[PDB]
Scaffold this active site. Structure first.
Site, PDB file in Angstrom:
ATOM      1  N   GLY A 163       7.463   1.254  -4.699  1.00 41.64           N
ATOM      2  CA  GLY A 163       6.125   1.329  -5.274  1.00 41.64           C
ATOM      3  C   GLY A 163       5.331   0.075  -4.961  1.00 41.64           C
TER       4      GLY A 163
ATOM      5  CG  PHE B 109       0.538  -0.711  -0.987  1.00 41.36           C
ATOM      6  CD1 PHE B 109      -0.077   0.440  -0.509  1.00 41.36           C
ATOM      7  CD2 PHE B 109      -0.135  -1.475  -1.935  1.00 41.36           C
ATOM      8  CE1 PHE B 109      -1.318   0.843  -1.001  1.00 41.36           C
ATOM      9  CE2 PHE B 109      -1.377  -1.073  -2.425  1.00 41.36           C
ATOM     10  CZ  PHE B 109      -1.958   0.085  -1.958  1.00 41.36           C
TER      11      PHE B 109
ATOM     12  CG  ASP C 158      -2.410  -0.654 -10.416  1.00 42.68           C
ATOM     13  OD1 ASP C 158      -2.609   0.333 -11.167  1.00 42.68           O
ATOM     14  OD2 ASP C 158      -1.685  -0.598  -9.399  1.00 42.68           O
TER      15      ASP C 158
END
Ligand code: NBK
Length: 277
Positions: free
Chosen positions: A32, A34, A142
């Site tokens: 997760g 990237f 995020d």
């Protein structure tokens, strides 16, 4: 604070970036953000090695290092090093033995359920980390349970500053204004509200095989008296009490206000969570 590592040193300590899971005898802990995270070792330290639009990924790598250099706090993950080849990018962190809040809430790999007592401490810790970021004029962008890591004492550690600064994010956690392109710390508050619902319910923020699919929609069910917060409390706890659960839900509900200016700031969120215990 902090070293550059040779790509070959990191390759060597992760058994050549062994993509097999830890259980099978490999080094893969997860994937997760990237990348793939591998378990590594540097003398007396177990580490987490994250092996990472071409130039945009390098910008995310540089941004994270920049944030880590400035932001040091008990409730933020600690960066130990970085590598940078070439077209091979690695970030080295202090290993969090209890993984993510997401995985602990779902009891992934057979870990025991978190008690209400532990859940309250984690919620307070996560709010303290966000407060440090907002006090230092940073917007995370995020905030989610996958980005809240847990150390040896289950202390909450805010992770992934790859998107941070002064349309990206995770749709199930995003504020309406964030989905429209606005950048504001008020959107971080909204996302933290979803995390608080995950802590109360033990449910993931989105589930395609669930009604409602989005966890944030339970706020409407409760407000319209179709359901109660009691109906949604994670049954995998024996120590929850209605008073403190309702108090955490009241915080989550305030964070989830559709109008950004009506949401409490992180200092108010901290105050409310402190009062709760
Ligand atoms: C940008 C950025 N990226 C990644 C980090 C970062 N990430 C992890 C991390 O990421 C994951 C959650 C994906 C694997 N995992 C762990 N540790 C761990 C992983 N799994 N577990 C288990 C082992 C099995 N048992 C049964 C339960 C706990 C412990 N530490 C980490 C430490 C970090 F700094 C920070 N910043």
């Amino acid at each position: 604070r902090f070293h550059s590592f040779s790509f070959y040193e990191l390759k060597n300590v992760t058994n050549n970036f062994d993509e097999r899971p830890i259980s099978v005898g490999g080094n893969k802990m997860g994937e997760g953000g990237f990348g793939v995270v591998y378990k590594g070792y540097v003398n007396n330290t177990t580490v987490a090695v994250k092996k990472l639009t071409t130039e945009e990924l390098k910008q995310q790598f540089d941004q994270e290092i920049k944030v880590m250099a400035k932001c040091q706090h008990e409730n933020l993950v600690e960066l130990l090093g970085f590598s940078s080849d070439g077209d091979d990018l690695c970030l080295v962190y202090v290993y969090m033995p209890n993984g993510s809040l997401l995985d602990r809430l779902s009891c992934l790999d057979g870990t025991p359920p978190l008690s209400w007592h532990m859940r309250c401490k984690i919620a307070q810790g996560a709010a303290n980390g966000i407060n440090f970021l907002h006090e230092n004029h940073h917007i995370h962008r995020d905030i989610k349970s996958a980005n809240i890591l847990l150390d040896e004492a289950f202390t909450a550690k805010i992770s992934d500053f790859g998107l941070a600064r002064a349309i990206v994010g995770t749709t199930a956690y995003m504020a309406p204004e964030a989905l429209r392109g606005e950048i504001t710390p008020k959107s971080d508050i909204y996302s933290f509200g979803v995390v608080l619902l995950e802590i109360i319910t033990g449910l993931p923020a989105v589930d395609e095989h669930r009604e409602p699919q989005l966890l944030l929609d339970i706020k409407e069910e409760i407000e319209d008296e179709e359901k109660t917060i009691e109906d949604y409390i994670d049954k995998k706890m024996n120590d929850a009490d209605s008073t403190s659960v309702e108090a955490m839900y009241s915080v989550a509900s305030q964070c989830l206000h559709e109008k950004k200016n009506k949401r409490p700031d992180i200092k108010k969120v901290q105050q409310l969570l402190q009062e709760m215990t």
